Amino acid sequence: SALQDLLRTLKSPSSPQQQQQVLNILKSNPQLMAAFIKQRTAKYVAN
Amino acid sequence: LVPGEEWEFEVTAFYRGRQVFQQTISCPEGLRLVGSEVGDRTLPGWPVTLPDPGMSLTDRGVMSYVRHVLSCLGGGLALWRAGQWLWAQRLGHCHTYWAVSEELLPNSGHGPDGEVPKDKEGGVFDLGPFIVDLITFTEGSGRSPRYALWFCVGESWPQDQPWTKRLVMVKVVPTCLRALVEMARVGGASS
């Protein structure tokens, strides 16, 4: 569901192969998945 | 040689700045840009045939040169992933120059990143630095990481001139990298 919301974000066309390869880069780079999770709520009203 | 690193590539070819071809292929052995019949199988990698300039171009003088270039491609231009690197190797008679750039190559005459080796493969793209900068991009660095590979086939790299005047330019894009950058952008990141 966390991966699904990311893929959902694909406002562009694709294929089953591209999607699997994206999940693969994410599975082998947990620090990248952490950034996407942190960016999802990083926006806040300052000053 | 080991499965788990298969990448889908979108190949776009331009004859004199004119898009004449575009195909997307996901092959475990990477691919090879050939300019002919699709025969000699002794070579590894999925053969992607560039079209004859006749069915798109009208100029007959240009069809001439492109046809010669495509003919000197022989084994072709091999490209494949292995580890954290993208590898390329030239198997024919035409020198090929590459550079990593934006989806749309800019005429910022700066010269090529290098030349594709013929004797042994050479690395043309490192996934490591790409992810490092993809992460800071999501943080706000404002600099989207590049992932598009551009190849000048048969002529020197168009440094002082517009690439659209080159006989054969090929743009290769690893679609998963394009997607990762788009998700970082839609997630709230700007350049």
The CATH number that applies at residue A45 is 1.10.1630.10
User: What is the domain range of residue A22?
Assistant: 1-47
Q: Which residue has the tokens 């404002």?
A: B142
User: Following CA atoms B161, B164, B168, B173 in sequence, which dihedral angle do they give, to the nearest 10 degrees?
Assistant: 110
Cα(B161)–Cα(B114) distance, integer angstroms? 17
The CATH number linked to B169 is 2.60.200.10
Q: Which of B88, B65, B77, B82 is nearest to B155 (CA)?
A: B65
Task: Verify whether the Cβ–Cβ distance A10 to B176 is below 8 Å.
Answer: no
Longest CA–CA separation in chain A, Å: 44
Tokens standing for residue B113: 């990143």
User: Structurally, how many domains does chain B consist of?
Assistant: 1
Task: Verify whether the Cβ–Cβ distance B176 to A25 is below 8 Å.
Answer: yes
Beta-sheet strand order (sheet of B31-34): B46-49, B31-34, B77-82, B85-90, B122-126
Experimental resolution (Å): 2.4
According to DSSP, the β-strands at B31-34 and B169-174 are unpaired
Instruction: Establish if A45 touches chain B: CB-CB under 8 angstroms.
Output: no
Phi, psi of B111 (to 5 degrees): 90, 160
Residue pair B171/B149 in contact (Cβ under 8 Å)? The answer is: yes
Structural method: X-ray
User: Structurally, how many domains does chain A consist of?
Assistant: 1
**A 5-34 residues with CB below 8 A of B?**
6, 9-12, 14-15, 17-19, 21-22, 24-25, 29, 31-32
User: What is the domain range of residue B171?
Assistant: 1-191
What DSSP designation does B165 have? G
Residue pair B124/B101 in contact (Cβ under 8 Å)? The answer is: no
Count of CB atoms within 10 A of residue B135's CB? 20
Instruction: Identify the three-state secondary structure at position B189.
Output: coil
One-letter amino acid identity for A42? Answer: A
Residue pair B152/B118 in contact (Cβ under 8 Å)? The answer is: no
